[PDB]
Amino acid sequence: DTDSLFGECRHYIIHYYLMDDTVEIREVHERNNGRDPFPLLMNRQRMPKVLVENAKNFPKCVLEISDQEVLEWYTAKDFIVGKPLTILGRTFFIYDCDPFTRQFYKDKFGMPDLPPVDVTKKE
Amino acid sequence: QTYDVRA
Amino acid sequence: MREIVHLQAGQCGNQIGAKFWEVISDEHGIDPTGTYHGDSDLQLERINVYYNEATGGKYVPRAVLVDLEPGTMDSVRSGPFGQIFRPDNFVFGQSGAGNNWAKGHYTEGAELVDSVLDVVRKEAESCDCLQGFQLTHSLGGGTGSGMGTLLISKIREEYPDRIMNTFSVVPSPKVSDTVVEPYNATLSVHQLVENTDETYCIDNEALYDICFRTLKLTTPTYGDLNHLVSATMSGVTTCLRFPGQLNADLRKLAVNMVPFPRLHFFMPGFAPLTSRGSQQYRALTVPELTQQMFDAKNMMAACDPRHGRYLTVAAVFRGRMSMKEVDEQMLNVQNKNSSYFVEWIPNNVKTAVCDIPPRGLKMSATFIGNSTAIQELFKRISEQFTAMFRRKAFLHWYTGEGMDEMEFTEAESNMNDLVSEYQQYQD
Amino acid sequence: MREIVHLQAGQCGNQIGAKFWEVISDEHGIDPTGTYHGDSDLQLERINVYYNEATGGKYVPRAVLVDLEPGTMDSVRSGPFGQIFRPDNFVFGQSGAGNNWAKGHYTEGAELVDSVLDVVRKEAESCDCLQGFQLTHSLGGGTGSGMGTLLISKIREEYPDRIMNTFSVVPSPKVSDTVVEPYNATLSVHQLVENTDETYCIDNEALYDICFRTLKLTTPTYGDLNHLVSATMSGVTTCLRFPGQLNADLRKLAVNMVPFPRLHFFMPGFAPLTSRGSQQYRALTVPELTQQMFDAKNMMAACDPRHGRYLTVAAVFRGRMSMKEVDEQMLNVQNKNSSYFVEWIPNNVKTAVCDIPPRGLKMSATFIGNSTAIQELFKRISEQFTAMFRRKAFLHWYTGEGMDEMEFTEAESNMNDLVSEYQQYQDAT
Amino acid sequence: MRECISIHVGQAGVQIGNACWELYCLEHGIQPDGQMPSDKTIGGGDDSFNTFFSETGAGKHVPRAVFVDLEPTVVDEVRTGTYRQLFHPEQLITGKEDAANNYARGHYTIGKEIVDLVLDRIRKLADLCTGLQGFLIFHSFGGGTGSGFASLLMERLSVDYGKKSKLEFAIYPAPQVSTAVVEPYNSILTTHTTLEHSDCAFMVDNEAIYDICRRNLDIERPTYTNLNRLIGQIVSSITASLRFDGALNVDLTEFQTNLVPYPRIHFPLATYAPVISAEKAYHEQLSVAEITNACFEPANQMVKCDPRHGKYMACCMLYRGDVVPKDVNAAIATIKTKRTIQFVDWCPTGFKVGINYQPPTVVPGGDLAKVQRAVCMLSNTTAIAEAWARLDHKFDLMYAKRAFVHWYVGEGMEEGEFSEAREDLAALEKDYEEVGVDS
Amino acid sequence: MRECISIHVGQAGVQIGNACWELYCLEHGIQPDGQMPDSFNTFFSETGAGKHVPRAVFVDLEPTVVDEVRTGTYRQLFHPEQLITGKEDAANNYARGHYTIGKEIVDLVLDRIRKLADLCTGLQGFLIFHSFGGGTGSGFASLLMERLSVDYGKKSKLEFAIYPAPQVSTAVVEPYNSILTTHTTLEHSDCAFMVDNEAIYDICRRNLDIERPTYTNLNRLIGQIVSSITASLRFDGALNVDLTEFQTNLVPYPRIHFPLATYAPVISAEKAYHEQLSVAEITNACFEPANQMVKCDPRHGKYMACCMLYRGDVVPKDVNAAIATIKTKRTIQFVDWCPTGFKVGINYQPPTVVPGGDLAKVQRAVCMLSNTTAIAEAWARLDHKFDLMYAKRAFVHWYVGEGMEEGEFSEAREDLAALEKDYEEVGVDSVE
Ligand SMILES: Nc1nc2c(ncn2[C@@H]2O[C@H](COP(=O)(O)OP(=O)(O)OP(=O)(O)O)[C@@H](O)[C@H]2O)c(=O)[nH]1
Ligand SMILES: Nc1nc2c(ncn2[C@@H]2O[C@H](COP(=O)(O)OP(=O)(O)OP(=O)(O)O)[C@@H](O)[C@H]2O)c(=O)[nH]1
Ligand SMILES: Nc1nc2c(ncn2[C@@H]2O[C@H](COP(=O)(O)OP(=O)(O)O)[C@@H](O)[C@H]2O)c(=O)[nH]1
Ligand SMILES: Nc1nc2c(ncn2[C@@H]2O[C@H](COP(=O)(O)OP(=O)(O)O)[C@@H](O)[C@H]2O)c(=O)[nH]1
Ligand SMILES: [Mg+2]
Ligand SMILES: [Mg+2]
């Protein structure tokens, strides 16, 4: 968020549940942190990516976006290490993931190579 | 292609 | 110009108001970040009614979030439009009220009202000309039913002339989730009648009934009941935010809706409510909006106006239409249902037109009505309140706060005085 | 031209002055080496006010660092901007005072004041037209509360016309760390009233309260309080160094701020302090400054002025702003809170404008105020001083130096005289 | 030279002002920029950019109008309309809070804030003109701004200009349909100023135009803009003899003189003809004979009343276009020999005829076809008496229960004025009944 | 030829010098180096090199406020010795600028005005710009004027100064300086132009639509007014008026020399596009109380002598029609002993416009110098502020510490009480 006057570098941790595919984004609070202690940015829910092209004739002021109107859900496919991914207009570049995630991705999902990428400046 | 790693 | 400050009390208030701030964020085209990316110029000319400008092109809501339990603030900040609200606008205590009116009104209400009044005064002085404050709360809660009644009493003394609209949630008999529900409602309604210029009675079970038949939603959560409420809440101030052929605001109906100061309870309604399957077969227009308005099935509360008598009727029309047809429907529905309108007030219907259609739709309509049937809800509460009050049941929770017993008697007295004056207007 | 010599007494003074000298080093764009690196012209136009020229393009601060204990000198020499100070400007003794006022002013103060005097007269003769001296110290120490009071006692005799500003640290009743605290404070306020042009009462408890709530930092180190006082310190002389649309200096405010010579205790305010989450939702506008200067929470003193009556108000604005908006707010605040102002003084507010903002910022404002609430702090000292002086507790440390018992009586009498007349002038017709 | 100033008040006055000034700009050929260095030259009226517009040395003809409202948005669209550069921004005056359908709010609390500013604006407008003929004021009896703020304005205008005429083009509440419920209180209470501080009234209800637009112009789903264009045609026809030359030129004074027999009777009825769509217009032949017969048709009246139930007292005629005096004359002689048309005993000669050259211009995208000849009628009659009677009946059933009163008395107006104004219409209805008696 | 010398003092004097000389240079066409790319000879002296050498004296007790001019765009317009500074300021203190710091620099600034006047052959007079609140603008200007009266007994001396505002104020000790300064502007002044910032703040938001004005916005307006009074001298006109004429036709008694100025029209570039300027139209606006740059109501007093200044495309026919309009209203009052209270001056060249300003390029202008008795109430509000001050003897030790006797404080209070007492003496009607 450097471009705005309120530049920040707060790190985030993103959880995806295999219960039903749900994503939550918790923040990493610092020592001083300048900020009120808050639990999470977003809560367990289903993110659409693109919805059915009949969205023009959908009264979004009355009915919510539902499984009839979406044609595709956020899945682990956008959730791959090394590549940025947008949620609600947030750039959210993935820095790294856990060893259990690396295992599961390599032996159950299929892609074997997800090397880490440093994101920290040299002071 | 190039947007660095940024802090 | 003309500003609005949105008060938010209780979990019912917090979830409804957060949903409301979404349904005007999409209208005024602001992202969850806080920037404008809309297209039309009219979308950004009167944004100052609900939003306050900050540096960096960011617009912040003029809302005060109050809830006595810190748990609800966690969900609101973690919502989709969570990072849009200001942290200082969040005010919250450490201990809840346990669904008890007496605790939240006197015991734990005293330590927090000074902080609520602080930010409310700050938001009051920030704007130049203020029209009124809007409060969303539940009448069966512990904070909104409790502290919220304390908030409205204090602001009326501070700002008498400004208008008070209340989007309160009134319980239902068929489905209830709290045993001490009648005690809080009966002790709160006494505060609304003395200090409120108009009230919008909404009941969850009517919303459940609408979703079960009218909208055809298989698994109705709490959100769709809130989104439908947020539609009506947007449908009253749409004429204020935008130009129209026959313009209106929150006082134009409020002047035109109060025959006597004791009568300010209304039936809100929303016309374009169709199932997703029947959306193609339905052809929305001024007639099809009208017959969907006037049935009791579309009504958002739990009283049949057919058993009652319509005092005054509002029709705030959103979108572009022809009024001679609008005029004809209002005159037609007046003539045929002659036994349902009052005889000492001719021309009971008030109409207004704002040209801007709602987002994702072509035509929309908001109905606000005062009918005799609102007494049926109140006497229903008396059937359960006194039956629980005749045995002094669940009184030690209320009595332990230090309150007397005549407060219960004077509350039941004024309501029985209200309905008797309300029944005599019917006859 | 208009120069300032920065006196520096005690561990409180050494750490505050070190932070201040770093702060205006950033504003004037001078590296820790001592060379100018700043981007703008006016960052080196009036730098002779605080800095002295050295061959090879070097600037040395015009500071005199004094402390009876040599331990603090090593810390300030080991700091970030430690090497910028001239080594000869460091003057220090071998034995401290042990929080004893009598040792620092009478016994151990006599041997070193001459060495302080030699450097002080050296810097004073260096500048052609000195505006005055400037001292930071603590009233709860043995050096600043002791030796410092002897220093301001002498310097009035030599240079009477020069402006004396004192940014003293006043003790708090709630938080304290010295058992013999009130005796030193009672023996220091007597020296301040006779020989000082203006005094700024700073308190650590209020600075903690600011950083706990306004900035909501969880772990306030001693740098953060030293940063807050340094910003207020720079906000007083920013109009002197840089040009402004309505200029002022120390003498411009001091004439407007002292109605009577006994009344020179002030109560400072700094506007633009907000938490990082508070940055996100904020419109940088001057009414937001004015509301934030005038609230009881922002002030860094231990007195609420709602029980006092505001005698005179001063507000120096740093930045390029519109004075019609500036002037209206001070008229507005004078009208809504009419009860808190004196009625014998119309137009209680003095205003000034400096166009250059502080570095890293667009807008700021510095507030200096005189009110009756400063009397609430002196009596609260007497509630503890007399309670300890009645049983003659901890007196042999003071008595062992060879001093009499009357000195405490006259110091208590002078402050009782001052608080009694101060109340009279508050409710004067 | 002759001149008129417009005092349009409230949402109704502003919207009518949008239509009428658009017609006046097109009538004289003025760009929305307010200038005319344009190549094409329409007309030859060098004197004619006076009266309505004000000539300046730089070439911009700034209009002589005052747009005032207590809500900004209705004027704000004019501020961002096509003719924004045409209007003087200071001629546009806005208020932050409106009357909210309350006559009291716009008369005692909110109106008085901007009265001094508005009356100062009128003064410099009157300072520019040399010979002011009269004031044209547009408002509505429904809204509080058009009823309250207008009422005090005429009260202060009368004490400032005693002699200058003040004409009332106003929206009357319709008998059956209504856009408000507290409307009768405001219309009851605004009758007092338009009775003592008025010279001529032009009441028209919105329902009659809906009848006219559907029946004749064939617009099945009309709009306010359709109503406003018809209104703009009337006012131009009133001012047509002033703007251009004619055989029988009439100013504002003569048709005021030949319409008011008694000072308390100044409520005529307006009628316009021919009003037909583009398709049907050319298929008929249009003469003077039938257009004046349409002027006497009860279905063509702009007010919901039957003149056959009443009796004419003074009819003012306004012909315009390629009219010839005999077919005006022969039309009148045919009018007299009808028993269905009745006239008072004390006015054997009850017509005032004015003749002009310029055929009425048609705005593009309208509903009126381009026609050669037209006619405007201003008929004072006793058939308007029933309109007040229904309004009293509507008011009486709602004053008895004291509905809506607390809004008014809480604002700061006494309840004794409510009964006082009702007595006035009780008195005014008897005055028309006195004239209906024949000796 | 007629000449005028500028004796700008204080922080007010230096900024008003920048605005006035910027307009003056554009008026004649002066390049910022000082070159014509001779009506300019009244304010400019020529060398071989063609540099015009503005005849101004910038004096202040603080160097920062003049060093900004020294680095300014007009660094090569003004003479380095004409810029005179002081090491320390008077610090809002009248006595400090009158007895301690002023006297060190009196010798130099009197030598400068001597040399500038030595350049001039026939000197019409001096214009002095200063303040009543600040110490340097009140104290140093007083003694300089005290020594100016003896040095040149005859030469006219005009006083343009700001007055302390009725409600707002930038300091707290201004009334002490303000009260003590009235002695100098009474026994050593020929004409006074007291103007407060609120009224210039008032006029800017309602006419020019500048909601957030600054001192440069006011200073351009006062630069316009000083341009208007002198423009009759600079360029030709039908009825040319000099400094002596309007001085004589404004001052009936020696102790009454406080005229109230008024300027019109003050409109934006947009406003001129849809409005028709006329001589009668701009004349009326000079009489509205909402346009006065002194917070006083002339309808509460009576007009006693009015000076007229027309500039632009002005015709004497419409001059007489406007004045004939003026005399036929009851709302405008005049004193009994002055049936004829006008002094008309007509000039040709219209006022120019500086780019980046606020005033539109106008074709006709009007300047009003109306001396009335309604200004006396302004001094009355100063005494009430002063009397509540002097009772408790606040801020006196600063004045006493400099070396000023406390008896003068009562004496200055008694003088303007007599000066007030002269004003309702004029307000008495001679009812025979
Ligand atoms: N015929 C016609 N009537 C209009 C028009 N605009 C408003 N009205 C009438 O005006 C009445 C309401 O008053 P408004 O003009 O809308 O508002 P107002 O005059 O500013 O008064 P307030 O509502 O108190 O502010 C409605 O009942 C309409 O009948 C219009 O364009 N044409
Ligand atoms: N209108 C106007 N007033 C000014 C201007 N500059 C200063 N002032 C006024 O002058 C008053 C203070 O006097 P200054 O001129 O600023 O300073 P000074 O006269 O040199 O007095 P000292 O500060 O003691 O040296 C302020 O209250 C301002 O209102 C200006 O450019 N325009
Ligand atoms: N319709 C609807 N009702 C809600 C929602 N959230 C809570 N409620 C109702 O609010 C009641 C509980 O209110 P409570 O949290 O105790 O209010 P509080 O004590 O003021 O915080 C329940 O009976 C719910 O029916 C919502 O999102 N929609
Ligand atoms: N606010 C603040 N207070 C300080 C700082 N350093 C020391 N103090 C205070 O100074 C007091 C001790 O002063 P001391 O060293 O005895 O002063 P000395 O005897 O004159 O050298 C303690 O109570 C601290 O609270 C500082 O950097 N900031
Ligand atoms: Mg209106
Ligand atoms: Mg100065």
- Element housing F346 (H / E): strand F344-347
| Residue E262 CB burial class (10 angstroms; 0-12, 13-18, ≥19) | exposed
Helix, strand and coil content of chain E, in percent to the nearest 5, comes to: 45, 15, 40
The closest CB to that of D279, out of A6, A31, A36, belongs to A6
Residues 346-375 of C with CB under 8 A from E: 346-352
Contact E302, E270 (CB under 8 A): yes
Tokens found for residue C200: 């919008």
Tokens found for residue E271: 């009628």
F242: Cα separation from own chain's centroid: 16
What gap in Å lies between CA C393 and CA C416, rounded to an integer?
21
The nearest CA of chain E is from the CA of F274 a distance in Å of: 6
State whether residue D216 sits within 8 Å of chain C by CB. Answer: no
The count of residues in chain B is 7
Contact E94, E71 (CB under 8 A): yes
Resolution in angstroms for this experimental structure? 3.5
**Rg, C-alpha atoms of chain B:** 6
Contact D346, F388 (CB under 8 A): yes
- Residue of E50, E60, E160 for testing the chain F interface, max F β-carbons within 10 Å: E60
Does residue E254 carry a catalytic annotation?
A: yes
Residue partners of D237: CB distance under 8 A and separation at least 6: D4, D49, D249, D250
The count of residues in chain D is 429
State whether residue C149 sits within 8 Å of chain E by CB. Answer: no
Task: Give the orientation angle of helix D113-126 with respect to helix D148-158, to 10 degrees.
Answer: 50
CA angle A19, A23, A27 (to 5 degrees): 130
What gap in Å lies between CA E228 and CA E19, rounded to an integer?
6
Q: Ligand 1, residues E171, E211, E226, E230: which to mutate, most atoms within 8 A of Cβ?
A: E171
Contact F6, F124 (CB under 8 A): no
Instruction: Determine whether the annotation assigns residue C223 to a binding site.
Output: no
Helix residue ranges per DSSP H, E167-304: 183-190, 193-196, 206-215, 224-243, 252-257, 278-283, 288-295
Domains and CATH numbers, chain C: 3-257 (3.40.50.1440), 265-374 (3.30.1330.20), 375-425 (1.10.287.600)
Whether ligand 2 lies within 6 angstroms of the CB of F178 is answered as no
* Residue F56 DSSP label: B
- Type of residue numbered F145: M
Residue partners of C249: CB distance under 8 A and separation at least 6: C2, C131, C237, C239, C240, E71, E98, E100
CA-C68 nearest atom, ligand 3: 21
Instruction: Determine whether the annotation assigns residue F62 to a binding site.
Output: yes
- Residue of D218, D273, D278 for testing the chain A interface, max A β-carbons within 10 Å: D218
Which chain C residue is nearest to residue A7, measuring alpha carbons?
A: C56
Partner-chain contact D429 F213, CB within 8 Å: no
Furthest CA-CA distance within chain B: 18
Q: Please name which of E13, E15, E5, E227 lies closest in space to residue E140, comparing C-alpha atoms.
A: E13
Whether ligand 3 lies within 6 angstroms of the CB of C99 is answered as yes
Contact C278, C213 (CB under 8 A): no
Return the residue whose CA atom lies nearest to atom 31 of ligand 2. Answer: F12
- Annotated catalytic residue, options E254, E290, E417, E429: E254
Q: Chains with ≥3 Cβ pairs under 8 A against D? A: A, C, F
Residues 3-62 of A with CB under 8 A from B: 9
Chain A residues with CB under 8 Å of C231 CB are 61-62
Whether ligand 1 lies within 6 angstroms of the CB of E145 is answered as yes
3-state secondary structure of C66: strand
Contact E184, E394 (CB under 8 A): yes
Three state DSSP letters for chain D: CCEEEEEEEHHHHHHHHHHHHHHHHHHCCECCCCCECCCCCHHHCCHHHCEEEECCCEEEECEEEEECCCHHHHHHHCCCCCCCCCHHHEEECCCCCCCCHHHHHHHCCCCCHHHHHHHHHHHHHHCCCEEEEEEEEECCCCHHHHHHHHHHHHHHHHCCCCEEEEEEEECCCCCCCCCCHHHHHHCCHHHHHHCCCEEECEEHHHHHHHHHHHCCCCCCCHHHHHHHHHHHHHHHHHHHHCCCCECCCHHHHHHHHCCCCCCCEECCEECCCCCHHHHHCCCCCHHHHHHHHCCCCCCCCCCCHHHCCEEEEEEEEECCCCHHHHHHHHHHHHHHCCCCECCCCCCCEEEEEECCCCCCCCCEEEEEEEEHHHHHHHHHHHHHHHHHHCCCCCCHHHHCCCCCCHHHHHHHHHHHHHHHHHHHHHCCC
Q: Please name which of E9, E305, E19 lies closest in space to residue E168, comparing C-alpha atoms.
A: E9
**Rg, C-alpha atoms of chain C:** 21
| Residue E11 CB burial class (10 angstroms; 0-12, 13-18, ≥19) | buried
Partner-chain contact C74 A39, CB within 8 Å: yes
Whether ligand 3 lies within 6 angstroms of the CB of C149 is answered as no
**Binding site for GTP: which residues of E?**
11, 71, 140, 144-145, 179, 206, 228
What gap in Å lies between CA D279 and CA C54, rounded to an integer?
9
- Element housing E321 (H / E): strand E312-321
- Element housing F184 (H / E): helix F184-187
What gap in Å lies between CA F165 and CA F185, rounded to an integer?
18
Residue partners of E343: CB distance under 8 A and separation at least 6: E311, E312, E313, E350
Q: Ligand 4, residues D7, D11, D14, D175: which to mutate, most atoms within 8 A of Cβ?
A: D11
Tokens found for residue D350: 């003095």
| Residue D301 CB burial class (10 angstroms; 0-12, 13-18, ≥19) | buried
Dihedral, CA atoms, D176, D177, D178, D181, nearest 10 degrees? -20
State whether residue C342 sits within 8 Å of chain D by CB. Answer: no
Whether ligand 1 lies within 6 angstroms of the CB of E12 is answered as yes
What gap in Å lies between CA F386 and CA E141, rounded to an integer?
56
Q: Please name which of D171, D131, D170, D133 lies closest in space to residue D152, comparing C-alpha atoms.
A: D133
Helix residue ranges per DSSP H, chain A: 99-104
CB atoms within 10 A of CB F254: 9
Q: CA quadruple C303, C306, C309, C311: dihedral positive or negative?
A: positive
What gap in Å lies between CA E119 and CA E156, rounded to an integer?
8
Q: Which experiment gave this structure? A: cryo-EM
What gap in Å lies between CA F70 and CA F77, rounded to an integer?
10
